Coordinates of C-alpha atoms (C1' of nucleotides) in Angstrom, one line a residue:
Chain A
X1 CA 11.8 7.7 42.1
X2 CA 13.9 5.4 39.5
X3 CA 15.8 2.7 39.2
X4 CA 18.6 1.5 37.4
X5 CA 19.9 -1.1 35.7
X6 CA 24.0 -1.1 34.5
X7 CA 24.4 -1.1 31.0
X8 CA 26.9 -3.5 29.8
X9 CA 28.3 -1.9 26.0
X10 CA 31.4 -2.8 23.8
X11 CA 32.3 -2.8 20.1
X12 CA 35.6 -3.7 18.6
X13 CA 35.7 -4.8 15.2
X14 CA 33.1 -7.2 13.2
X15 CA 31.1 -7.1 16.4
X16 CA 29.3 -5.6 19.2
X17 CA 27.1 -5.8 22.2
X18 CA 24.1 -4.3 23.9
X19 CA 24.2 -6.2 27.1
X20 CA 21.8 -4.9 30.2
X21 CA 22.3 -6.4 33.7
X22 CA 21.6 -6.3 37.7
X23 CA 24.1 -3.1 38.9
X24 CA 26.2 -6.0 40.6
X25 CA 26.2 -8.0 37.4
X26 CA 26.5 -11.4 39.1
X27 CA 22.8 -11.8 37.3
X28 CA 22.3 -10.5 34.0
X29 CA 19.3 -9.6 31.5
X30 CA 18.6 -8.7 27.7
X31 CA 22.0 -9.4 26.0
X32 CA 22.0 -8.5 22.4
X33 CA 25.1 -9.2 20.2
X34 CA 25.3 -7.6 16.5
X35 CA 25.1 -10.4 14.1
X36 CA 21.5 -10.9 15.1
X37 CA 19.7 -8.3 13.8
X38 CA 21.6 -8.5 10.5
X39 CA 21.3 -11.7 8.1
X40 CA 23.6 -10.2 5.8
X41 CA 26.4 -11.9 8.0
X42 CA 29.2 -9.2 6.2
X43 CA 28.4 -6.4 8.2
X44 CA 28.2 -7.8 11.9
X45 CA 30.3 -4.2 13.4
X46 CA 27.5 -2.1 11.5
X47 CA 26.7 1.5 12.6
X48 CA 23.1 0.3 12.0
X49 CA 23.5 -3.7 13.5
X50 CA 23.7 -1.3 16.8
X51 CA 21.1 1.0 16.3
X52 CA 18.1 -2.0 15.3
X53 CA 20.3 -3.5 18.6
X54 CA 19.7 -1.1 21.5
X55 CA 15.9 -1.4 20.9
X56 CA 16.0 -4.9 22.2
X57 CA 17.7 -3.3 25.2
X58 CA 15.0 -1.2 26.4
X59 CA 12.3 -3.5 24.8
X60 CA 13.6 -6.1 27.3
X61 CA 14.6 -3.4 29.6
X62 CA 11.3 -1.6 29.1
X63 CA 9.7 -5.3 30.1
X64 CA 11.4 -5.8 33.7
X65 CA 10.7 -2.6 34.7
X66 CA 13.9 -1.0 34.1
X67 CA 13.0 2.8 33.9
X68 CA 16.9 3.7 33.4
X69 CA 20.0 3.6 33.2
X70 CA 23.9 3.9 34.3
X71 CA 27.3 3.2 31.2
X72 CA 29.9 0.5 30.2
X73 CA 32.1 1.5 27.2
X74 CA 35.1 -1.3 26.5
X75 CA 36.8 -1.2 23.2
X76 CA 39.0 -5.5 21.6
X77 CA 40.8 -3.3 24.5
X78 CA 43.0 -6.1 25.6
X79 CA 46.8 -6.4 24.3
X80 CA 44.0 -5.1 20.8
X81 CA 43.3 -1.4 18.7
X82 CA 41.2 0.7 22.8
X83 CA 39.5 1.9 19.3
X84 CA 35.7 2.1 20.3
X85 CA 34.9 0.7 16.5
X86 CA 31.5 1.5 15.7
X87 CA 28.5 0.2 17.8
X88 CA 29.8 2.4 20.4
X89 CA 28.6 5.7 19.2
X90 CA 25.4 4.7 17.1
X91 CA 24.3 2.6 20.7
X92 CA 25.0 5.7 23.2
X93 CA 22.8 7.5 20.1
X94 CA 19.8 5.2 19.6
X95 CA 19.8 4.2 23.9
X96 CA 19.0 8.1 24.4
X97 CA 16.1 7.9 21.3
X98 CA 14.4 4.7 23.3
X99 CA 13.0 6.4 26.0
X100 CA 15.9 6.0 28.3
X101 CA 17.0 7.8 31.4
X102 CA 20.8 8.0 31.4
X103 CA 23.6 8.2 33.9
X104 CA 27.4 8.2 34.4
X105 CA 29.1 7.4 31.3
X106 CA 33.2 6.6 31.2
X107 CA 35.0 4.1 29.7
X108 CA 36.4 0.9 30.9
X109 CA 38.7 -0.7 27.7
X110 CA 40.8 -3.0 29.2
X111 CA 44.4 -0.7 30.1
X112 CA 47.8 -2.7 30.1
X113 CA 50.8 -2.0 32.1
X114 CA 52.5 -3.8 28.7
X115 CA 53.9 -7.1 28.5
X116 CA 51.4 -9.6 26.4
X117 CA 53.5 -9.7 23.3
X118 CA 51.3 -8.3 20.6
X119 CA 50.6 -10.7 17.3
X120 CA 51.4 -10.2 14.2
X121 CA 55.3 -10.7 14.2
X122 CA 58.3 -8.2 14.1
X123 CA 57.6 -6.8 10.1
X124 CA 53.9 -6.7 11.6
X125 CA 50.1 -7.4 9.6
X126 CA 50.6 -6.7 6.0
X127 CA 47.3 -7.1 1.8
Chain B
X1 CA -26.0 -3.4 -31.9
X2 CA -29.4 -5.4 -31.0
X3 CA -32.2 -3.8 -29.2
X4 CA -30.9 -3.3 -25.3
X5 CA -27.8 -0.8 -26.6
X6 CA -29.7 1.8 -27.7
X7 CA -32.4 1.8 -24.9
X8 CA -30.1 1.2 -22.0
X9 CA -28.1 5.1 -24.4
X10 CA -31.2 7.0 -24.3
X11 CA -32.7 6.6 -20.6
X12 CA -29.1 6.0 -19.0
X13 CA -27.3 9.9 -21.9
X14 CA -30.0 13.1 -21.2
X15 CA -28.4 13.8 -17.4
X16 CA -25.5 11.3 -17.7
X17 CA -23.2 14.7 -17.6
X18 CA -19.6 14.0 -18.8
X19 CA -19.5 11.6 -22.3
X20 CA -17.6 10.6 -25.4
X21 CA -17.0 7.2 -27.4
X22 CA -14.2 6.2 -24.6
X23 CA -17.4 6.9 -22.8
X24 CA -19.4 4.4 -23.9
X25 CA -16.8 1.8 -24.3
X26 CA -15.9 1.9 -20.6
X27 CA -19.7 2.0 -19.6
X28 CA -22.9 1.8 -22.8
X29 CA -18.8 -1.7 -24.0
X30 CA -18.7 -3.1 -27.7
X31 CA -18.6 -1.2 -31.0
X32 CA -17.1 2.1 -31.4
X33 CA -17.2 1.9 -34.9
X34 CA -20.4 3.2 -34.7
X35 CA -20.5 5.1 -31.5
X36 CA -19.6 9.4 -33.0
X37 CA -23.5 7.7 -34.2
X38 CA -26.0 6.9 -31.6
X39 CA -25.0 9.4 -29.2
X40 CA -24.7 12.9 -32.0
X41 CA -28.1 10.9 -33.4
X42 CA -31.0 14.1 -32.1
X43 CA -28.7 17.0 -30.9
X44 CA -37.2 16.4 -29.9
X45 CA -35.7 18.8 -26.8
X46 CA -34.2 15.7 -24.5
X47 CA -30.6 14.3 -25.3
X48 CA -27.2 15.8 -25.2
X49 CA -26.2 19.9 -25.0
X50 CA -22.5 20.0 -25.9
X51 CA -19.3 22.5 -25.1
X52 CA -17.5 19.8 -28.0
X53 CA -13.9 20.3 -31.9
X54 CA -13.1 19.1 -35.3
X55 CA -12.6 15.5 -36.5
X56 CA -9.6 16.5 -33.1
X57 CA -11.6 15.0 -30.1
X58 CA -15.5 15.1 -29.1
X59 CA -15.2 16.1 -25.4
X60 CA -20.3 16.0 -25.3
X61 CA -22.1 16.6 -22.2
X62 CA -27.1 18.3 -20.3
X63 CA -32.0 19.9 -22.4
X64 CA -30.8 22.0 -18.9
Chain C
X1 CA 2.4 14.5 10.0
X2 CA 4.1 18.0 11.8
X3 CA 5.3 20.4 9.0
X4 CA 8.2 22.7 10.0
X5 CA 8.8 25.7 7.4
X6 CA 12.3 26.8 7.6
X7 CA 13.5 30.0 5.5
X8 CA 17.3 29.8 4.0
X9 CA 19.5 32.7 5.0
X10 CA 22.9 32.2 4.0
X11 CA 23.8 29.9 1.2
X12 CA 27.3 28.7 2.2
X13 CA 29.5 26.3 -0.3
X14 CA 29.6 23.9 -3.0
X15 CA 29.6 20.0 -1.8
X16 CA 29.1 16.6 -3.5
X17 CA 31.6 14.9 -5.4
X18 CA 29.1 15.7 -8.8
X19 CA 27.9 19.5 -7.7
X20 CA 24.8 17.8 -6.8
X21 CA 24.6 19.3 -3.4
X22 CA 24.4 22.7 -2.1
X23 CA 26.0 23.8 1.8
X24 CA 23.0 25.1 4.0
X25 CA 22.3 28.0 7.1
X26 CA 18.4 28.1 8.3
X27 CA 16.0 30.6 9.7
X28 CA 13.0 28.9 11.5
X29 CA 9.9 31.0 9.6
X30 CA 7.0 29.6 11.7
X31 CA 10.8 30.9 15.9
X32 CA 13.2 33.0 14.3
X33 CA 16.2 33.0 16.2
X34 CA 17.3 29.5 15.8
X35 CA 19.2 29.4 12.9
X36 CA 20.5 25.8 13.3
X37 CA 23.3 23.9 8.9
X38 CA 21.1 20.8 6.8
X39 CA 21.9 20.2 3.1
X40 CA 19.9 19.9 -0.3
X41 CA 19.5 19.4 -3.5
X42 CA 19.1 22.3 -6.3
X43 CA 19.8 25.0 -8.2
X44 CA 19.5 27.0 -4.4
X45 CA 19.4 30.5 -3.8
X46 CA 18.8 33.0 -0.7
X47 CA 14.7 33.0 0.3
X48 CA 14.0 29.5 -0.8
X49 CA 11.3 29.5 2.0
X50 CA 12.5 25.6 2.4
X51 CA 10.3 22.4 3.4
X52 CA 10.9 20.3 6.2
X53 CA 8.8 17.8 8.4
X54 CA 12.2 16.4 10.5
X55 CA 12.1 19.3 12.6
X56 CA 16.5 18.3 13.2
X57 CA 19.3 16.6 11.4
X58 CA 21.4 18.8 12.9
X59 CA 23.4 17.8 9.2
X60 CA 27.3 17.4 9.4
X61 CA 29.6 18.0 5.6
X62 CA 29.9 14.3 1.6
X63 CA 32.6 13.1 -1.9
Chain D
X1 CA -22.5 47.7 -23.8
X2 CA -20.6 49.4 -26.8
X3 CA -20.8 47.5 -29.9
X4 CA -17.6 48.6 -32.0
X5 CA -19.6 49.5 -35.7
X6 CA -16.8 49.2 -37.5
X7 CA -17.3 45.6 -43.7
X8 CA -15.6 43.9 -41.1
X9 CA -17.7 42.3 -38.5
X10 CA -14.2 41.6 -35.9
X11 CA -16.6 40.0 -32.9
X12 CA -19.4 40.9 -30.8
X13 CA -18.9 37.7 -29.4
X14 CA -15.5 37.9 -28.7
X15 CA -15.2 41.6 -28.6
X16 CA -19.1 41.2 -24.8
X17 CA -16.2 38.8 -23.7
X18 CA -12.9 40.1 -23.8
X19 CA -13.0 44.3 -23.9
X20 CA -16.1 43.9 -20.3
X21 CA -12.1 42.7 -18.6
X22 CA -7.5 40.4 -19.2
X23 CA -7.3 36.6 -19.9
X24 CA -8.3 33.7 -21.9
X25 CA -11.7 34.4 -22.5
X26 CA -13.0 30.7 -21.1
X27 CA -11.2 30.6 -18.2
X28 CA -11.3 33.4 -15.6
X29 CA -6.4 33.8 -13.8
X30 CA -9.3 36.5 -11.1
X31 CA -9.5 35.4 -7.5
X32 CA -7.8 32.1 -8.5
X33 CA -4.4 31.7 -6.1
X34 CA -2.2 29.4 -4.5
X35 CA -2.4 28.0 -0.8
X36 CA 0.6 26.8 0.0
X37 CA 3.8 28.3 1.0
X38 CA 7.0 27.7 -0.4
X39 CA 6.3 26.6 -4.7
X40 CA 4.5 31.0 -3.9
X41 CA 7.3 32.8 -5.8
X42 CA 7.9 29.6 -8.1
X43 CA 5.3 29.2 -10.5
X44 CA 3.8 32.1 -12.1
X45 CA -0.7 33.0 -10.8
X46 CA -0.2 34.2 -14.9
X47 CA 0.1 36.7 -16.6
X48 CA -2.2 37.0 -19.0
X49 CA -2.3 33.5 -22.0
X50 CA -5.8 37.4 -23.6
X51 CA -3.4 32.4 -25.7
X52 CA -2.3 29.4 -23.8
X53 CA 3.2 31.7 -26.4
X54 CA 6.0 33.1 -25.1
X55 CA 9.6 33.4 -28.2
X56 CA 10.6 32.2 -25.3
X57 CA 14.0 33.1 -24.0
X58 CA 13.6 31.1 -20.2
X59 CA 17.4 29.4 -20.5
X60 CA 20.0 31.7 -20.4
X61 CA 18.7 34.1 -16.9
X62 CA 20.0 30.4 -14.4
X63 CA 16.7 31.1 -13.0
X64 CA 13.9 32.4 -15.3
X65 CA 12.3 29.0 -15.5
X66 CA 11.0 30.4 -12.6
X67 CA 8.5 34.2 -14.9
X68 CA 7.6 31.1 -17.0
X69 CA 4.1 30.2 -17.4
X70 CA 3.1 27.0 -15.4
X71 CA 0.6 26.2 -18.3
X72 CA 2.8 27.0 -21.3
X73 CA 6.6 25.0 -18.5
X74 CA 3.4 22.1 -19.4
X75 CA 2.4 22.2 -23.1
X76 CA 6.4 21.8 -21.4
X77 CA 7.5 17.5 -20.9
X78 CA 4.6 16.7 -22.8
X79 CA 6.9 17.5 -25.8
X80 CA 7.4 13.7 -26.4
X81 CA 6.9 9.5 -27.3
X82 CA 10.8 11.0 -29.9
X83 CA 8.4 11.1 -32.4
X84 CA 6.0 14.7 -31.7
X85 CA 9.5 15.8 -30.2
X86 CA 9.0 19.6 -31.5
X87 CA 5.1 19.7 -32.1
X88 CA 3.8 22.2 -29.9
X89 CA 0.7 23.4 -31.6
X90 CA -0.4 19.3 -31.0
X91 CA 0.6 19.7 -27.3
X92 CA -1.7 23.4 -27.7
X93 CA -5.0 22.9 -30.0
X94 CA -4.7 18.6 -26.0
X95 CA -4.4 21.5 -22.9
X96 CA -6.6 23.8 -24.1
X97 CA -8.2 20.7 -23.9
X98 CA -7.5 19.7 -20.0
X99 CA -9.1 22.8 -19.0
X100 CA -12.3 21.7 -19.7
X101 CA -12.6 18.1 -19.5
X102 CA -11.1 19.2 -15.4
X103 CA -13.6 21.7 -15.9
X104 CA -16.4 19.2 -16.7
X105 CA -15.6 16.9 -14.4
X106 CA -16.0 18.6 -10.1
X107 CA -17.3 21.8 -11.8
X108 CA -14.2 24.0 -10.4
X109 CA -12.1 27.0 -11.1
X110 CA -10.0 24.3 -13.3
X111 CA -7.2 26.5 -13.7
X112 CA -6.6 26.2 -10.4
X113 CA -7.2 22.6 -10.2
X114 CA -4.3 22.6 -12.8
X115 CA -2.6 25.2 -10.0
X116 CA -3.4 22.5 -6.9
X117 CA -1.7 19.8 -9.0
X118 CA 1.7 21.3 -8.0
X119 CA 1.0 22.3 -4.4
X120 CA 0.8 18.1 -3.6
X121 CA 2.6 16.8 -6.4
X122 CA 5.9 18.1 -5.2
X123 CA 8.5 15.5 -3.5
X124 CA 9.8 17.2 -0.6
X125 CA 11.7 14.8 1.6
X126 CA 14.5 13.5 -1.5
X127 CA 17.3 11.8 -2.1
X128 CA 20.8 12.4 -3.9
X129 CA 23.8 10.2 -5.6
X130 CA 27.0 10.7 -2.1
X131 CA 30.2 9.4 -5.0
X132 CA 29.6 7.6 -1.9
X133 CA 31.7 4.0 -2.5
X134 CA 30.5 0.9 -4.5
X135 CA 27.2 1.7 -1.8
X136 CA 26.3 4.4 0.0
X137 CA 23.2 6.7 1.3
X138 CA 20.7 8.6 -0.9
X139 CA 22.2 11.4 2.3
X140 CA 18.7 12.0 2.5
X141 CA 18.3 16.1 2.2
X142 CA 14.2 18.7 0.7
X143 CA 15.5 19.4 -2.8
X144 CA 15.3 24.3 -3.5
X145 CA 12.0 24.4 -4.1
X146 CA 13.2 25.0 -7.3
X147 CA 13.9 21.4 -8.5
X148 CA 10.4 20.7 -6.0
X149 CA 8.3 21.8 -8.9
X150 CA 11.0 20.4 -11.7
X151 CA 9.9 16.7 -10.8
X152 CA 6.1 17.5 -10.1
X153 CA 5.2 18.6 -14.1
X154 CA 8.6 16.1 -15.4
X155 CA 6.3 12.8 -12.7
X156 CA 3.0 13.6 -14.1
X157 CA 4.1 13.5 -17.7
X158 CA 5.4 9.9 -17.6
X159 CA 2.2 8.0 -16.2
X160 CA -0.8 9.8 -18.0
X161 CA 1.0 9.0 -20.8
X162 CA 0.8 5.3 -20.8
X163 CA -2.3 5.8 -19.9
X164 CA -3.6 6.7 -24.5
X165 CA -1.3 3.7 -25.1
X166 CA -3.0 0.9 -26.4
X167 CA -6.1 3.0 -25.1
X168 CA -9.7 3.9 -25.5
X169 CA -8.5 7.3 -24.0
X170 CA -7.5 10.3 -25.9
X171 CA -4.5 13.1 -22.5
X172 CA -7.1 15.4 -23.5
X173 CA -9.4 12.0 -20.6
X174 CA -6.1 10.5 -18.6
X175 CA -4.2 13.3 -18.1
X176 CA -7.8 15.0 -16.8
X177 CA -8.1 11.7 -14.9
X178 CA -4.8 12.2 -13.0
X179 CA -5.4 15.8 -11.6
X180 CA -8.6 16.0 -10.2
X181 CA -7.3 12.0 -8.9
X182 CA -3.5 14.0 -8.1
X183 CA -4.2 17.0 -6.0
X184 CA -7.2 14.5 -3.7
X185 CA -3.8 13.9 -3.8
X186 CA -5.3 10.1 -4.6
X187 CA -3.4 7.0 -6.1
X188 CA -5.5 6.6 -8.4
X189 CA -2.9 8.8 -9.9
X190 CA 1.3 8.3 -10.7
X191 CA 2.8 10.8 -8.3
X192 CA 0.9 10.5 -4.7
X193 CA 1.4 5.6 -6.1
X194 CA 5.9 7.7 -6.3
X195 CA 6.0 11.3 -5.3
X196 CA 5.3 9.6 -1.7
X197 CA 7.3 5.4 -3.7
X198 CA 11.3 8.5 -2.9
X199 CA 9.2 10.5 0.5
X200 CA 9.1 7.0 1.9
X201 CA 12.9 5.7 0.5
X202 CA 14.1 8.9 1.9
X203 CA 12.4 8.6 5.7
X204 CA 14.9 5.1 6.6
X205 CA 19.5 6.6 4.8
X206 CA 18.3 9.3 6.6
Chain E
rA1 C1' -34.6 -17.5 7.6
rA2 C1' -40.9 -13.2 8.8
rA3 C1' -45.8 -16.1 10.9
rA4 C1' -48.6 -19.0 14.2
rA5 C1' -48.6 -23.0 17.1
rU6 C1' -49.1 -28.9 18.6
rG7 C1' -44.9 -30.7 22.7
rU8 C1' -40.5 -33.3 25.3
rG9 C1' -39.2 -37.2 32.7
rA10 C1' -41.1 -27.6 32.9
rU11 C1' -37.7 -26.5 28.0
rC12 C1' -33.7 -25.7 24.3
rU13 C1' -28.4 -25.6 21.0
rU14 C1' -22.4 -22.1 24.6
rG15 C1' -18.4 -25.5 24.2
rC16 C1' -14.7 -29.4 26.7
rU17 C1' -11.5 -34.9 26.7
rU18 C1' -11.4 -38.7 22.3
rG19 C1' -10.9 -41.1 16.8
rU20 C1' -11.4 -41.1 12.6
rA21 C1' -14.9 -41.2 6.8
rA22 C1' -12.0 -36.6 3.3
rA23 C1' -10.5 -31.7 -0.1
rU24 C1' -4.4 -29.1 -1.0
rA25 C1' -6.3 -31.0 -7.6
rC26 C1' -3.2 -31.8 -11.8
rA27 C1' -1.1 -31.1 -16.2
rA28 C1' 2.0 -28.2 -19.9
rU29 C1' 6.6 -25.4 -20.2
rU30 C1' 10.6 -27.0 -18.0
rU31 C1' 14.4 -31.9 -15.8
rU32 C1' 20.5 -35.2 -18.8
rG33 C1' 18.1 -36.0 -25.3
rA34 C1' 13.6 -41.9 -25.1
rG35 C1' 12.0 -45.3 -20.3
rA36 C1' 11.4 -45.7 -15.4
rG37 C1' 14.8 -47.2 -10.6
rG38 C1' 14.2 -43.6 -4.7
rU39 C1' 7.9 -36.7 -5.7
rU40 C1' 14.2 -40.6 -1.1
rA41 C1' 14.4 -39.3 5.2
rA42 C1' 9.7 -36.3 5.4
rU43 C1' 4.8 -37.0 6.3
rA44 C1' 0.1 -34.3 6.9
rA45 C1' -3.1 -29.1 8.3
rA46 C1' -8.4 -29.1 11.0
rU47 C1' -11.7 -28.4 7.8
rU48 C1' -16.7 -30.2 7.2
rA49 C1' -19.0 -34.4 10.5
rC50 C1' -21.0 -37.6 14.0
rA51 C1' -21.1 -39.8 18.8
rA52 C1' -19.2 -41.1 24.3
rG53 C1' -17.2 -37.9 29.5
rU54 C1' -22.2 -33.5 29.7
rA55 C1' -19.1 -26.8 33.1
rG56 C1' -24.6 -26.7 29.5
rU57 C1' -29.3 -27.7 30.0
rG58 C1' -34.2 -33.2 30.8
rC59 C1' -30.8 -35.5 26.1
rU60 C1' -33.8 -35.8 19.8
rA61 C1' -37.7 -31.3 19.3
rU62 C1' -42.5 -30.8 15.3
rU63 C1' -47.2 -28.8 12.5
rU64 C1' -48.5 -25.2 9.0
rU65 C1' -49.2 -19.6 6.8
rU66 C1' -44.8 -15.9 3.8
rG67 C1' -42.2 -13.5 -0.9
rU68 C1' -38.5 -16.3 -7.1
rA69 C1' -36.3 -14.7 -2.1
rU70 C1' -36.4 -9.9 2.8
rU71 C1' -31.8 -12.6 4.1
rU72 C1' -28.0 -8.9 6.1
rA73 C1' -23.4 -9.1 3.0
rG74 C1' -18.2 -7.5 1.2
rG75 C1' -12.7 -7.2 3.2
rU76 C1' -8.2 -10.7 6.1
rU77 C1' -1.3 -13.2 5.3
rA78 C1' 5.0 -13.1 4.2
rG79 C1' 9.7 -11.0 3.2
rC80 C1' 13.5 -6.5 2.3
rU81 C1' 15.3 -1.6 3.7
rA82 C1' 18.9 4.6 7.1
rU83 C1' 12.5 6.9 2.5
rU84 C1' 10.8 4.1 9.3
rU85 C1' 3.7 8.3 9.8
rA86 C1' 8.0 5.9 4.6
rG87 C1' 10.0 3.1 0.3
rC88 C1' 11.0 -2.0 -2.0
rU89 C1' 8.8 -7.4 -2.9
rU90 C1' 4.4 -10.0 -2.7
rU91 C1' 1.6 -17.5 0.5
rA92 C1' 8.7 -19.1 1.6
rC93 C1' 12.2 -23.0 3.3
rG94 C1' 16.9 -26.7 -0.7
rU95 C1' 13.9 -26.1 -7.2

RNA sequence: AAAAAUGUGAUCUUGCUUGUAAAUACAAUUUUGAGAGGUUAAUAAAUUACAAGUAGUGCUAUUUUUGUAUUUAGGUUAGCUAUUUAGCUUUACGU
């Protein structure tokens, strides 16, 4: 007797995102990036910005009648880092502390099979 | 120092348990120089019995 | 406001950058057999019964 | 029942008082105790001050502070504000004084309201300066109970002290106007309005 | 507001659509050092208050015995923080 929303986390660096939708994802709900519970603007990546974060995603998860809850983490993944930078961990903690049920949990960080020549340049990013 | 200080004192400082002269600055407001005066006065059997020492404090207190 | 007394048992090692902090085990006074490692701040020995309310946080080694 | 007949008249007075029983002969140190646990073990209930001095040799045993009485680590503190700095016998002539300005006003056991203004007045939940970076957390973590009882004579010192300070109030009348209201604890007091203020920067960093 | 009691197509008093008569005082430090050209754009709060359209209820409603009066009064926001049953500022919004 539950339901379940799909979570919809990621964190490079300088940001992240709590991002609820439905477990299609062609709709979505509650999306919650960093910056927005922080304005200091320096800190946008910030073990905390997650933390007050999540709580909007089980405030407005809590609202729609979404119990629980299964969940997606991506990196920049990409060419970037596959480094989960902060967010995800403090997110994963503070989704647990709000209530929510979990389920499945895996990572998605966006693998490739090479080729999208990486920037910086040859003597590489350098302070 | 007219004549509604000292009978306020008297019918107020029989019962009125803890005092001093912080005492009756803080309650009875002006004076001090004065108060250690009409308190002290006597010591008629109906004002203040005392546990008080010296000069350096006057910690008075009650005929019962 | 739920008060959980916790008894030290083995004082462990020196932390901090300035020697501020011991580490800490504890043994759950009032549930023995717990045994949980949190930090603090004195000059600690073995028996300081030790106050907590956070029932809890388990505390990782600080610099 | 038995006065010594000696010339020398050395009291009756303070002979029935102090032969019937030990103690200082005001106060009686007789089914008055502690009821918390943690600051028993740390904080002597006394022996013995038949005055309120001991050479004093608490600093060597990293411990003994401990076997210290309480009343006389108080009379400790007060010894300030630089200018007393040294004057005991000021600091002992001002708590036998506290003892019965508490116990005039309540009418306890004010020996032990001195004794409940420490457990109450400790900060459990504190902080500590992680080095760290530039900024850091202050990580949160409940002092022994050693240092507990360090802060909660050290607090009360600095805040019954401003209060004679440009005041009507001889100390003796703020000191006992902080630990009848510090144990009820108030606010009204210094500890309970930042004893709670280091509890409450402590509850966030953590 | 405590008492009666004359009544007014039998009697009293809970707001809803309008539009206007008016209070936030200012002065003094401080703004470039005397003396005003632009408290520039912005602007008003809903407050006492009264009448249309009356879900109310027939809309205004008196004489005369009380106590100096007896009636009831006193308290209310906004911002930081890993001290989140707590610490920190305290009616800001270019000063």
């Amino acid at each position: 007797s539950q339901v379940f929303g799909v979570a919809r986390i990621y964190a490079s660096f300088n940001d992240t995102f709590v991002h609820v939708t439905d477990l299609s994802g062609k709709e979505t709900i509650a999306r919650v990036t960093g910056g927005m519970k922080v304005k200091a603007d320096r800190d946008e990546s910030s073990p905390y910005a997650a933390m007050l974060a999540a709580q909007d995603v089980a405030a407005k998860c809590k609202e729609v009648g979404i119990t629980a809850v299964h969940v997606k983490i991506r990196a920049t993944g990409g060419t970037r880092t596959k480094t989960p930078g902060p967010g995800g961990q403090a997110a994963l903690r503070a989704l647990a502390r709000s209530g929510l049920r979990i389920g499945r949990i895996e990572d998605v960080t966006p693998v490739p099979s090479d080729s999208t020549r990486k920037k910086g340049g040859r003597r590489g990013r350098r302070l | 120092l007219d004549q509604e200080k000292y009978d306020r004192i008297l019918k107020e400082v029989p019962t009125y348990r803890y005092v001093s002269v912080s005492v009756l600055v803080d309650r009875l407001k002006i004076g001090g120089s004065l108060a250690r005066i009409a308190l002290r006065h006597l010591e008629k059997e109906g004002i203040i019995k005392p546990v008080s020492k010296h000069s350096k404090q006057a910690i008075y207190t009650r005929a019962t | 406001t739920p008060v959980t007394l916790a008894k030290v048992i083995k004082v462990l090692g020196r932390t901090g950058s300035r020697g501020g902090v011991t580490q800490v085990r504890v043994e759950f006074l009032e549930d023995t057999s717990r045994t949980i490692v949190r930090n603090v701040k004195g000059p600690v020995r073995e028996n300081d019964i030790l106050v907590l309310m956070e029932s809890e946080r388990e505390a990782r080694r600080l610099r | 029942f038995t006065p010594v007949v000696l010339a020398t008249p050395i009291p009756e007075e303070v002979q029935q008082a102090q032969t019937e029983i030990k103690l200082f002969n005001k106060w009686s140190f007789e089914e008055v105790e502690v009821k918390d646990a943690s600051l028993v073990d740390y904080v002597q209930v006394a022996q013995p001050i038949f005055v309120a001095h001991t050479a004093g040799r608490y600093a060597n045993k990293r411990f003994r502070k401990a076997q210290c009485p309480i009343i006389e680590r108080l009379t400790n503190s007060l010894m300030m504000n630089g200018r007393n700095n040294g004057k005991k016998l000021k600091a002992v002539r001002i708590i036998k004084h506290t003892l019965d300005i508490i116990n005039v006003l309540t009418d306890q056991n004010p020996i032990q309201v001195v004794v409940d203004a420490i457990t109450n007045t400790g900060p459990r939940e504190d902080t500590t300066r992680v080095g760290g970076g530039g900024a850091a957390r202050r990580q949160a973590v409940d002092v022994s109970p050693l240092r507990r009882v360090n802060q909660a004579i050290a607090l009360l010192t600095i805040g019954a002290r401003e209060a004679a300070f440009r005041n009507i109030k001889t100390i003796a009348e703020t000191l006992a106007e902080e630990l009848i209201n510090a144990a009820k604890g108030s606010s009204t007091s210094y500890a309970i309005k930042k004893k709670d203020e280091l509890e409450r920067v402590a509850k966030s960093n953590r």
